[PDB]
Structure formats: structure tokens, C-alpha cells
Amino acid sequence: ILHSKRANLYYLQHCRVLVNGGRVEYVTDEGRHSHYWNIPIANTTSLLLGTGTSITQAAMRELARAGVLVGFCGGGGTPLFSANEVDVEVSWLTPQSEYRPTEYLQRWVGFWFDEEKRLVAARHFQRARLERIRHSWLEDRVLRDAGFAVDATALAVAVEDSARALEQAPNHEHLLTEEARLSKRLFKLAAQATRYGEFVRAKRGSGGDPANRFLDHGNYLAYGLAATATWVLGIPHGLAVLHGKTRRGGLVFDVADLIKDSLILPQAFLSAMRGDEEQDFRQACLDNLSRAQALDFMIDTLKDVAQRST
DNA sequence: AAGCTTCCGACCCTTTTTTCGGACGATTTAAAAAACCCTTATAAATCAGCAAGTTACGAGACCTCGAAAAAAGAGGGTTTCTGGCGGGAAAAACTCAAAAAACGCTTCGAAATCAACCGGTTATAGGTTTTCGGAGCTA
């Protein structure tokens, strides 16, 4: 249930959170034996209330006493609906509320306005993304066994070439387009491996074939996971690195990018070819995300870029 | 002392909850009615297989009504495909005009010519092979 070992983030489902006798208690079908009792309550913990759960104001009081962030997310924890805002660590605020302020916003803003540094960040994002493609498509054979048998030499050549291109070109405007070309080739490779036939990527949900729908669902979950990552870091969604400065919710899409083609896309084609239900697809996606430590990776990346930007 | 405003008691009426009583059902117990047993030698039933005559139970059919399901009919709405009409821009006819350019006069003497047949010229109809442009695709 520990959703991110890097963030001390826990997912609670099928239980009520209430305060009896001055201690926050979980009313669950397992009673005393539920693992929720092992939840450490400290300023380092952060909760994610899941499906079928409710919380009492008294609990909110006790958690605030202990300084524990709370957030509501849907099935499996991908769509993050609402959460507590996290503080910002600077010398002029200084409340004693015992809430672990986080300093990453200052680091982010310290460079966000300098375009050259912003570009350097974009490059760093894409380096990470490609290396996660090469990892999941080649190094690990779980997909191979599942049925996603694809050629390697063509994929390796394409990825090598795109990586070679990343280290070049002057502005965001090229990077976006280079990624788009890589995207197209990856789609073609996946369709060939899946024997799905010809594939064309419609957008704004105009597609009707299973592949398109499953891609949309997968991307929706990925966005939710990224939103969780940013919220844990406290960075507002508007300070995008690679998407346009006017794009509402740009940053989450920047962060979501580092898994779409690594983990969502193959599963979308696999499930479409296998003829799965939408529910089966959702469960498979969440299982893949859990297996890959996705949230932890996207946390590590954001921290790495912050430290590297100095 | 008077007027205004606010409680308070008395009451009137209907609805909602509780209590009690009565009735009905069910069960138990006791009393009454039907029944069982014990004495029978003699009269009637038991049964053997088949014939000859009859029918109580089963099957088939149809009707009757009622209800259920399905199909049709109605109405609410949204999306899109087409047609008609209106409006701006370009083309080409229409109107206005000049300046060439041709024609005629008009050429006696200089080419132009056709005819058949050879070799030779070369524009190009037709076919063959190939860059340029665009397909969009993808973030």
C-alpha cells in the first residue's frame, strides 16, 4: 500500500478514518489486523484517501496536530482530486505549524525565467524519457513474455538517432517536433509488433478503435500520477519546462511525458489486441505503473533537475 | 394614568402515539363418539385361462379469456447535409479609338510551279523513366 517509498505516501481504501479516544482509528473489514495500523503518523507521512472511504473532521484535527498532508484520489490512486497545499520554505515565512515546508519551488523559480536554463531542463527531461523507453522496451522482457515482441535493431537505431538529435537544435520549437517524429515512429513500431495493422493517432478523443480509447485512458491515468508527483513537490502546475508557457496545466503534461511511451503505449496496444475490457485495461495499467516505480521515478527526476539547474 | 408590547392561562380542534380490550387463531386438555376385542360352525369368497361384452382414464381437439410481449406509433432532441440566396472579385464581352497594316491601283520581267523518283532531314507522337510536390504525421 506504500504508494511511493520516496515520499512516504500511503493509499487507503475500503475504510473509514475516525478518531476514538483521541487516536485516529481505521474502521475496516479486517479490524485489528489491517495493515493501516502500521501507518506512521508524523510530519513525514502523507495520506491518499482512495475509493470507498470517508474521514471525520476530528481526524482532520488530529492529523493537523501531527502535520500530515491529506489528499483524495480515485481508484488505484491515479486521478488526484483534492489535497492540502504544501508550504514553501523561505526566510520570511516562519510559522511553527509543524508541517515540513518544501524548498523546491524556490529552486524552480530561481531558473524558470532564464530561457537558456529552461531549455537545458527540457533537454534533461527528454534524456530521461528516452532512456526509459530503451529500458522498458528492451532491457526488461516482461513485455516480451506478455506478447509485445518487437524488433530491437530498428528501435535502438531510432532511439540512438533521436538522442543524438536532442543534444542539438536551438530552441524548444525543435525539441517538440523531434519528439513528435520519434512518437510517430514508435507508434508504427508498436503497431507492427502487435499486428494491429495500420494505426493513425487521432486526438481530442475522436477515435473509435480500441487502441485510441485505451491510449486516452492510459494518458489520463499518467496525468493523474504526475499531478500527485508535483503536489508532493509543491510545484504549481503552471511552471512548465517543455510545454508552452501559456498552457493551462503544462507542467503535469511535461512530467506525464516520461512514462506515456514507456509504460502506457505498449499496454494500450497489448490490451486492444487481447480484446480486454476497459476495466481490465485500467487494472493492467495500474499494475504496470506499480511495477515500474513510476511515481518515484518522476519524483527523482524533478528533484534531479532542480539540483542540476543550480 | 394611558397606550403599547409581551407573556401567560384558558380554550378549541385535529392528528399521532400508546394502551387497552376484543376477536381470532392456535394449542392443549378433557370429554364424547366411533371403534376394537372376545367368544363362532356355517355361508360365502378365493382363483386357477380364456371367451364375450363394457368402460374409466387418456388423448385430441377447440374455445375462452386473460395477460404478456412485441411491434408499431408518437414525441423529444441533436447533428449534418443540401439548397437557395446574397455578396465581392475577376473575366470577357461591350463600347470607344488610333495606328498602323493591308489592299488596290498594277505591274513585264523574275520566281513558282508541279509532275516521279532517289536519297536524306527531323519534328514529334508515342512511350518510358524519373524529381517535385504533397500526403499529411507527430509533439
Domains of chain A, by residue range, sit at 1-95, 96-310
Taken in order A61, A226, A11, A276, the sign of the CA dihedral is positive
A179 is in an annotated binding site: yes
With beta carbons less than 8 A apart as the criterion, state whether A10 and A48 touch: yes
C-alpha distances in Å from residue A102, one per residue of A7, A57, A69, A87, A105? 12, 26, 13, 6, 8
Angstrom distance, A160 CA to B4 C1':
97
Residue A54 pairs with which residues in a beta bridge?
A16
Give every CB contact of residue A292 below 8 A, 6+ residues apart in sequence.
A136, A259, A262, A263
Check the annotation: does A29 bind a ligand: no
Q: Of A166, A120, A164, whose CA–CA distance to A308 is shortest? A: A120
The shares of helix, strand and coil residues in chain A, as percent rounded to the nearest 5, are 55, 10, 30
**Nearest nucleotide over every DNA/RNA strand to the A187 CA, judged by C1':** B138
Element (H, E) at A137: none
d(C-alpha A257, C-alpha A297), whole Å: 12
Q: Is A257 annotated as a binding residue?
A: yes
* Rounded Cα–Cα distance for residues A161 and A156 (Å): 8
CA pair distance A200, A44, nearest whole angstrom: 46
DSSP string computed for A263-285 = IIHHHHHHHHHHT--HHHHHHHH
Estimate to the nearest angstrom the gap between the alpha carbon of A6 and the chain centroid. Answer: 13
CB A9 within 8 A of CB A232: yes
Q: Helix axis angle, A153-166 relative to A115-134, nearest 10°? A: 170
Number of neighbouring beta carbons within 10 Å of residue A38:
9
Q: What is the dihedral of CA A301, A305, A308, A310, to 10 degrees?
A: -150
Residue A217 near residue A75 (C-beta atoms within 8 A): no
Residue A102 DSSP label: B
Radius of gyration of chain A measured on its C-alpha atoms:
21
Question: Rounded to whole angstroms, how far apart are CA atoms A307 and A170?
Answer: 23
Give the count of alpha carbons within 13 A of A274, CB side only. Answer: 16
CA-based nearest residue to A190, from A172, A211, A204, A219: A211
Protein footprint on strand B: which nucleotides are under 7 Å from a CB? 137-139
Cβ–Cβ < 8 Å for A220, A268: no
Cell triple for A77? 490512486
- Distance between the alpha carbon (CA) of A66 and the C1' atom of B116, Å: 124
- Report the alpha-carbon distance of residue A215 to residue A269 in Å, rounded: 8
Identify whether the C-beta of residue A218 lies closer than 8 Å to the C-beta of residue A267. Answer: yes
Which residues surround strand B, with CB < 7 Å?
Answer: A 176-177, 179-181, 183-184, 187, 199-201, 203, 257
Rounded to whole angstroms, the Cα distance separating A111 from A59 reads: 39
CA distance A274 to A175: 34
